[PDB]
Design an enzyme around this catalytic site. Structure first.
Site, PDB file in Angstrom:
ATOM      1  N   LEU A   1       0.831  -1.198   0.000  1.00 20.34           N
ATOM      2  CA  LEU A   1       0.000   0.000   0.000  1.00 20.34           C
ATOM      3  C   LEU A   1       0.870   1.254   0.000  1.00 20.34           C
ATOM      4  O   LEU A   1       0.498   2.294  -0.546  1.00 20.34           O
ATOM      5  CB  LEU A   1      -0.895   0.001   1.235  1.00 20.34           C
ATOM      6  CG  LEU A   1      -1.942  -1.109   1.299  1.00 20.34           C
ATOM      7  CD1 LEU A   1      -2.511  -1.205   2.696  1.00 20.34           C
ATOM      8  CD2 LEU A   1      -3.034  -0.826   0.286  1.00 20.34           C
TER       9      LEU A   1
ATOM     10  N   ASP B   1       1.938  16.013  11.545  1.00 19.35           N
ATOM     11  CA  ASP B   1       2.316  15.823  10.151  1.00 19.35           C
ATOM     12  C   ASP B   1       1.131  15.650   9.212  1.00 19.35           C
ATOM     13  O   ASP B   1       1.169  14.809   8.318  1.00 19.35           O
ATOM     14  CB  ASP B   1       3.266  14.634  10.027  1.00 19.35           C
ATOM     15  CG  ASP B   1       3.789  14.440   8.609  1.00 19.35           C
ATOM     16  OD1 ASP B   1       4.058  15.447   7.915  1.00 19.35           O
ATOM     17  OD2 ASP B   1       3.945  13.271   8.195  1.00 19.35           O
TER      18      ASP B   1
ATOM     19  N   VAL C   1       4.237  -1.048   4.184  1.00 16.87           N
ATOM     20  CA  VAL C   1       2.875  -1.359   4.571  1.00 16.87           C
ATOM     21  C   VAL C   1       2.191  -2.130   3.450  1.00 16.87           C
ATOM     22  O   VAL C   1       1.854  -1.561   2.416  1.00 16.87           O
ATOM     23  CB  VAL C   1       2.084  -0.067   4.848  1.00 16.87           C
ATOM     24  CG1 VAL C   1       0.663  -0.401   5.264  1.00 16.87           C
ATOM     25  CG2 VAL C   1       2.785   0.743   5.923  1.00 16.87           C
TER      26      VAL C   1
HETATM   27  C1  LIG Z   1      -3.757   4.696  12.678  1.00 13.84           C
HETATM   28  O1  LIG Z   1      -2.409   5.132  12.515  1.00 13.84           O
HETATM   29  C2  LIG Z   1      -1.581   4.625  11.438  1.00 13.84           C
HETATM   30  C3  LIG Z   1      -2.006   4.372  10.026  1.00 13.84           C
HETATM   31  C4  LIG Z   1      -1.080   3.854   9.019  1.00 13.84           C
HETATM   32  C5  LIG Z   1      -1.536   3.600   7.590  1.00 13.84           C
HETATM   33  C6  LIG Z   1      -0.720   3.993   6.432  1.00 13.84           C
HETATM   34  C7  LIG Z   1      -1.163   3.752   5.055  1.00 13.84           C
HETATM   35  C8  LIG Z   1      -2.450   3.101   4.841  1.00 13.84           C
HETATM   36  C9  LIG Z   1      -3.263   2.708   5.952  1.00 13.84           C
HETATM   37  C10 LIG Z   1      -2.837   2.940   7.327  1.00 13.84           C
HETATM   38  N1  LIG Z   1      -4.403   2.127   5.496  1.00 13.84           N
HETATM   39  C11 LIG Z   1      -4.430   2.100   4.135  1.00 13.84           C
HETATM   40  O2  LIG Z   1      -5.370   1.623   3.494  1.00 13.84           O
HETATM   41  C12 LIG Z   1      -3.138   2.743   3.562  1.00 13.84           C
HETATM   42  C13 LIG Z   1      -2.641   2.980   2.306  1.00 13.84           C
HETATM   43  C14 LIG Z   1      -3.407   2.937   1.031  1.00 13.84           C
HETATM   44  C15 LIG Z   1      -2.903   3.233  -0.178  1.00 13.84           C
HETATM   45  C16 LIG Z   1      -3.956   3.068  -1.164  1.00 13.84           C
HETATM   46  C17 LIG Z   1      -5.018   2.684  -0.467  1.00 13.84           C
HETATM   47  N2  LIG Z   1      -4.563   2.630   0.925  1.00 13.84           N
HETATM   48  C18 LIG Z   1       0.295   3.589   9.431  1.00 13.84           C
HETATM   49  C19 LIG Z   1       0.746   3.823  10.791  1.00 13.84           C
HETATM   50  C20 LIG Z   1      -0.168   4.335  11.800  1.00 13.84           C
HETATM   51  O3  LIG Z   1       0.295   4.546  13.097  1.00 13.84           O
END
Ligand SMILES: COc1cc(-c2ccc3c(c2)NC(=O)/C3=C\c2ccc[nH]2)ccc1O
Length: 268
Positions: free
Chosen positions: A14, A129, A22
């Site tokens: 992602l 941020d 991730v």
């Molecule tokens: C609640 O706090 C957080 C969220 C994410 C995080 C970072 C990226 C994505 C995500 C969650 N959920 C998704 O679905 C993400 C990326 C994405 C890219 C295209 C669709 N989704 C990473 C660390 C954290 O401490």
């Protein structure tokens, strides 16, 4: 190709970055899709702690505008951050370069960013941020603040804790972070949300940084709205920016007062 984490199949990446990676994890058994941040800790000086705070914060957070935190595990070095999946992607990818997005959609996404922010602030947490790359949109297309790696507590036992650690992203950080030693935590996020309102409305970043020397920032400080990106923005929503991107973090508009702004409450 196709890995997996404790009963969950690792579909695709992602997002990545020197942070680690991730991968979208889903289990063909239940098929519930989730976000899995795999923090690749190293030594005991950078990753192996910048995540201890990250996980704690999460377990506190629970709001329809904050990517949910399911849980965490830990082999040893590789740690797993079970997180909510937002199919929609990043708000960033809904901003057309140099153009933006329809004003109504800007207003809606801003209401949620304000919803989720006020929430966090309520429980004394500052994101530090805020930006389109951290504001995700889901299936139904609802804004959820994301990436809490740089967050931190500024109010514990009803006692503020002025901040002084510089961090965030230059074209989004408030000016006080450059001219000051310590600064209140909340006005930094309001400024960052303000810069995010501009991208959505002008599809561009006002300046590289709020440096009193950045020529573009000086021109906004000289009410020269007769220029980009302010020209692509409508005076109504521009009136709110005039109250948000205010230099003295003491005179800046406060979240509460932002809910009483004309543009904010303008049926669109
Ligand atoms: C609640 O706090 C957080 C969220 C994410 C995080 C970072 C990226 C994505 C995500 C969650 N959920 C998704 O679905 C993400 C990326 C994405 C890219 C295209 C669709 N989704 C990473 C660390 C954290 O401490």
């Amino acid at each position: 190709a196709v890995p997996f984490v404790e009963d969950w199949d690792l579909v695709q990446t992602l997002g990545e970055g020197a942070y680690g990676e991730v991968q979208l994890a889903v289990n063909r058994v239940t098929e519930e899709a989730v976000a899995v941040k795999i923090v690749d800790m190293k030594r005991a000086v950078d990753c192996p702690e910048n995540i201890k705070k990250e996980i704690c914060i999460n377990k506190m957070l629970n709001h329809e505008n904050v990517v949910k935190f399911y849980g965490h595990r830990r082999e040893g070095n590789i740690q797993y951050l079970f997180l909510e999946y937002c199919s929609g992607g990043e708000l960033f990818d809904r901003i057309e370069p140099d153009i933006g997005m329809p004003e109504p959609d800007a207003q809606r996404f801003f209401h949620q960013l304000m919803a989720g922010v006020v929430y966090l602030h309520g429980i004394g947490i500052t994101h530090r941020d805020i930006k389109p790359e951290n504001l995700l949109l889901d299936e139904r297309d609802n804004l959820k603040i994301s990436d809490f790696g740089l967050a931190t507590v500024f109010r514990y036992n009803n006692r503020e804790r002025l901040l002084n650690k510089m961090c965030g992203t230059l074209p989004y950080v408030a000016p006080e972070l450059l001219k000051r030693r310590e600064f209140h935590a909340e006005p930094v996020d309001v400024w960052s949300c303000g810069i995010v309102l501009t991208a959505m409305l002008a599809g561009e970043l006002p300046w590289d940084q709020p440096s009193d020397s950045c020529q573009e920032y000086s021109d906004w400080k000289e009410k020269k709205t007769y220029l980009n990106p302010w020209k692509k923005i409508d005076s109504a929503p521009l009136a709110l920016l005039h109250k948000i991107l205010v230099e003295n973090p003491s005179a800046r508009i406060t979240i509460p007062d932002i809910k009483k702004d004309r543009w904010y409450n303008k049926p669109l």
